[PDB]
Structure formats: C-alpha cells, structure tokens
Motif scaffolding. Structure first.
Motif, PDB file in Angstrom:
ATOM      1  N   UNK A   3       0.846  -1.184   0.000  1.00 42.26           N
ATOM      2  CA  UNK A   3       0.000   0.000   0.000  1.00 42.26           C
ATOM      3  C   UNK A   3       0.883   1.237   0.000  1.00 42.26           C
ATOM      4  N   UNK A   4       1.289   1.656  -1.186  1.00 45.07           N
ATOM      5  CA  UNK A   4       2.151   2.808  -1.335  1.00 45.07           C
ATOM      6  C   UNK A   4       1.566   4.051  -0.685  1.00 45.07           C
ATOM      7  N   UNK A   5       2.383   4.741   0.107  1.00 48.14           N
ATOM      8  CA  UNK A   5       1.936   5.965   0.756  1.00 48.14           C
ATOM      9  C   UNK A   5       1.296   6.849  -0.314  1.00 48.14           C
ATOM     10  N   UNK A  39       4.461  13.887  -3.491  1.00 50.37           N
ATOM     11  CA  UNK A  39       4.127  12.505  -3.791  1.00 50.37           C
ATOM     12  C   UNK A  39       5.422  11.726  -3.947  1.00 50.37           C
ATOM     13  N   UNK A  40       5.333  10.414  -3.778  1.00 49.07           N
ATOM     14  CA  UNK A  40       6.473   9.529  -3.942  1.00 49.07           C
ATOM     15  C   UNK A  40       7.070   9.858  -5.318  1.00 49.07           C
ATOM     16  N   UNK A  97       9.922   5.864  -1.892  1.00 51.41           N
ATOM     17  CA  UNK A  97       8.701   5.053  -1.942  1.00 51.41           C
ATOM     18  C   UNK A  97       8.515   4.374  -0.600  1.00 51.41           C
ATOM     19  N   UNK A  98       7.270   4.242  -0.177  1.00 48.06           N
ATOM     20  CA  UNK A  98       7.022   3.610   1.100  1.00 48.06           C
ATOM     21  C   UNK A  98       5.597   3.130   1.286  1.00 48.06           C
ATOM     22  N   UNK A  99       5.473   2.272   2.287  1.00 48.25           N
ATOM     23  CA  UNK A  99       4.215   1.689   2.707  1.00 48.25           C
ATOM     24  C   UNK A  99       3.423   2.812   3.374  1.00 48.25           C
ATOM     25  N   UNK A 100       2.115   2.854   3.153  1.00 47.82           N
ATOM     26  CA  UNK A 100       1.256   3.888   3.737  1.00 47.82           C
ATOM     27  C   UNK A 100       1.237   3.751   5.257  1.00 47.82           C
TER      28      UNK A 100
END
Length: 138
Positions: A3-5, A39-40, A97-100
């Motif tokens: 779940x990309x942030x 945004x990422x 990039x990261x997990x939400x």
C-alpha cells in the motif's frame, strides 16, 4: 510494497553554526517547518533547501549569511534507516517510496491511516556578513 503511501508531508529543520562565537545562537532549538506535501518520486533539490535555510536564517538571525552546508539528512516516518544526502556537491532528493502509514485504533483495534512524513534536517556553518573565515591567516 503493498500500500504505497499516498502522500508525504516534507518537514524541515535546520541548525546554524557561526564560524566564531555568538550567544544569540542558543543550542537546543527544536522546531520544524512543513515545506510541502509531495508525492512519492517528487524531488527537492539542494538549491531549494538553501533558499529555505537562507530565508529562515534571515528571520531568526539578521546580519548572518550561509557560509556552507555541513550535512543534510532525511528521516522517513519512524523508520530507523535514514538517507544521508551528499555533503559537498549539489543534490536532488527524490521522495522515497514507502508503505502507507497507519496506527492502531485503541478502542477497536482496527487500523487507521495517517500521513507519512519525511523530516529533512540540515546544518549550515554561518558567517556574520562583512566578516571573513580563517584564523590568524590560514
């Protein structure tokens, strides 16, 4: 990466160190300023950060100017691994990039999403304008 942030609030904090002593620079300053929500993949360059630091320096310490950058670090959320930006060259930082992010609802024990954040922290050596670095010549 499941779940990309969906967003990353980029916060900024800067510490200033004068080449020769000055009380006004009380150690312990602890504040952050939200730069922007990106945004990422979005990028932030060293020139933009310099502009930010110079303007903050103007407000809090009129009469001083950036002499040189000492370090730039990014801490992502509560993650332990930080990214160390290059110390002696211009750079671009891409919002990693990261997990939400989320926390656990105390009552229900269910997950509630919250904003992801990047904390960019810098340190610059500053100089009273008119003054010059060095010791007694070299």
């Amino acid at each position: 990466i499941q779940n990309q942030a969906k967003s990353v609030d980029v916060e900024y904090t800067v510490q200033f160190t004068p080449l020769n002593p000055d009380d006004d620079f009380r150690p312990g300053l602890k504040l952050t300023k939200l730069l922007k929500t990106l945004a990422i993949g979005d990028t932030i360059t060293s020139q933009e950060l310099l502009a930010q630091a110079q303007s903050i320096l103007n407000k809090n310490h009129p009469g001083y100017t950036i002499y040189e950058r000492d370090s730039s670090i990014v801490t992502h959320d509560n993650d332990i691994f930080r990214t160390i930006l290059p110390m002696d060259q211009e750079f671009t930082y891409r919002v990693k990039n990261r997990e939400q992010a989320y926390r656990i609802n105390k009552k229900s024990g269910l997950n509630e999403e919250i904003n992801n954040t990047d904390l960019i922290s810098e340190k610059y050596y500053v100089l009273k304008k008119g003054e010059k670095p060095y010791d007694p010549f070299d």
